[PDB]
Structures are given as C-alpha cells and as structure tokens.
Amino acid sequence: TVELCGRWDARDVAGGRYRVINNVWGAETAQCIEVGLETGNFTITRADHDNGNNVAAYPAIYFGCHWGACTSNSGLPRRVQELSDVRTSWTLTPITTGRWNAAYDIWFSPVTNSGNGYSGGAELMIWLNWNGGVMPGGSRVATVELAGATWEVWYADWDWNYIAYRRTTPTTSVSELDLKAFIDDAVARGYIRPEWYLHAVETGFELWEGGAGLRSADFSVTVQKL
Ligand SMILES: OC[C@H]1O[C@@H](O[C@H]2[C@H](O)[C@@H](O)[C@H](O[C@H]3[C@H](O)[C@@H](O)[C@H](O)O[C@@H]3CO)O[C@@H]2CO)[C@H](O)[C@@H](O)[C@@H]1O
C-alpha cells in the first residue's frame, strides 16, 4: 500500500479504472489514507479534523471525471437520457466515534467540461452509514423505496441541485446497487434534467470530526449506454 497525506494527493488505482483522492477540501487539519493500488481499497489512518458544522474533507474513490481529472476509459461524461444501466458495489468499515458519513457523491452538469465544477448541475448523494448525528443538507422532502431499500430524500436548491438519499437504516455494503434507480427518481422530482451529463460516481467519507479507522473497499462502478 501507499500512504497519502497531502491535501490534494491522489493515486490512479485498479489499472486506471478508478482514482483515490485524499481530498481535504474544507479544512487544514491533517489526514492520511493508506491505499491498496490494485483494489483502490483505503483506510483513513489519520484524521485530526474538528470542523464544526462544515465538512472538513471527503477522502474518496471515483469513476469518471472529478473537476476535470478523469479516470481511464470510463465512458463518462454521458447524458442521463443515454444511460440504460448504472451499477456500483462497495464495502465500508464503520467506526463508533467522530462525526462522518459513508456516502456516494455523484456529479451531474449541463456541460461536458468539468474543470470548473458542476455549477447549474446536480450532486446526488447516497448515504449508507454515519455517526455523530450528522445530517444531509437541505430538508427531507420524501421517503421512497428504491433499488432494494428505503431512503429519506433530502433536497437543497444551491448553485447546483443537492439531492441526498439517506438509507432509513445503516448498512455496511452494497452489491450491484442500481444507481440508475436513484437518478430516475431525481429526474422525476425535477432535480436532474435528462439532457444533463453524468460526470462521476464517487464514494467515500464526508468527515466533520475525526474519521480514523474508516475503510473503503471492494469498489466497482459500471455504466451501460443505451
Ligand atoms: O480538487 C478539485 C477541486 O475540488 C474542490 O473541492 C470540492 C471537492 O472536490 C468535492 O469532493 C466536494 O464535494 C462536496 C460538496 O461540495 C457538498 O455539497 C456535498 O454535500 O459533499 C461533497 C463531499 O464532501 O466539493 C468541494 C467544493 O465544491 C475545490 O473547491 C477546488 O478548489 C478544487 O480545484
């Protein structure tokens, strides 16, 4: 494995199919992750965060294009209306301390260039586990059954539409989770336009306080075009 401690450190993994990012985007507090280069599995070995109500970081693994940095042959960005299947698998190891979540972060925008972000697009999160009383942004607008489980639907109308699906009960793993079901629900709600592009599928841990001991493993994402 390799240890990453730099704020914006990254490593291509799984033959370039995915990329792992330390991503300490909202704080100066220290954080390191130990990464398996073949699998992309990583454990947060250190996290001095104590950021109050604002996220300190989001160590993650992703498929696609994150702020212009794309993985190898992901087939993304690709219009939502041109998607027929989007699947993902992940196994997370939770901890009993700190304030954090274990969640997917999926980015959409009207344009194909993601170098400057996703303004005017959407961010769809899928929260699988958490600790410390953290809550999604915005307000809960519904509770819906999708892809084999039940989810609270949280929405915030920011520079981009924020949609977070929070499982009614925590879990530590998903296998071939139907991401397209979530995208379809968000489109139905008017939060994502079919003409918009899916840029990236990411998962990891949003950290507010602490986080050492959390582990991400068995990541996979596949996308099938129509
Ligand atoms: O490294 C490239 C660019 O990163 C920008 O930071 C973003 C992070 O990369 C991204 O993971 C994070 O996503 C947040 C999202 O903002 C929030 O709404 C959601 O609830 O949680 C996600 C996970 O924490 O967003 C930030 C900021 O948009 C840097 O801002 C940029 O300078 C840098 O080039």
Q: Which atom of ligand 1 is nearest to the CA of 69?
A: 2
Q: Could you tell me if 134 and 208 are in contact, meaning their C-beta atoms sit under 8 angstroms apart?
A: yes
**Three-state DSSP state, 14:** helix
Q: Could you tell me if 54 and 26 are in contact, meaning their C-beta atoms sit under 8 angstroms apart?
A: yes
Q: Which atom of ligand 1 is nearest to the CA of 117?
A: 28
Active site residues: 123, 206
Phi and psi at residue 66, in whole multiples of 5°?
-105, 110
Domain 1-226: assigned CATH number: 2.60.120.180
Tokens of 181: 């079901």
Query: Which of 49, 58, 70 has the most ligand 1 atoms within 8 A of CB, as the residue to mutate?
Result: 58
Resolution (A): 1.7
Q: Which atom of ligand 1 is nearest to the CA of 58?
A: 24
Q: Could you tell me if 58 and 25 are in contact, meaning their C-beta atoms sit under 8 angstroms apart?
A: yes
Tell me the C-alpha distance between 71 and 165, whole Å: 25
87 CB contacts (<8 Å, ≥6 apart)?
176, 177, 178, 179, 180, 220, 221, 222
* Cα 171 to averaged position of ligand 1 atoms, centre (Å): 25
Lining residues, ligand 1, CB within 6 Å: 8, 23, 25, 55, 58, 67, 105, 123, 137, 162, 206
CA angle 191, 217, 124 (to 5 degrees): 5
The total of other beta-carbon atoms located within 10 Å of residue 15's CB is 11
Name which of 86, 94, 64, 102 is nearest 185 in CA terms: 86
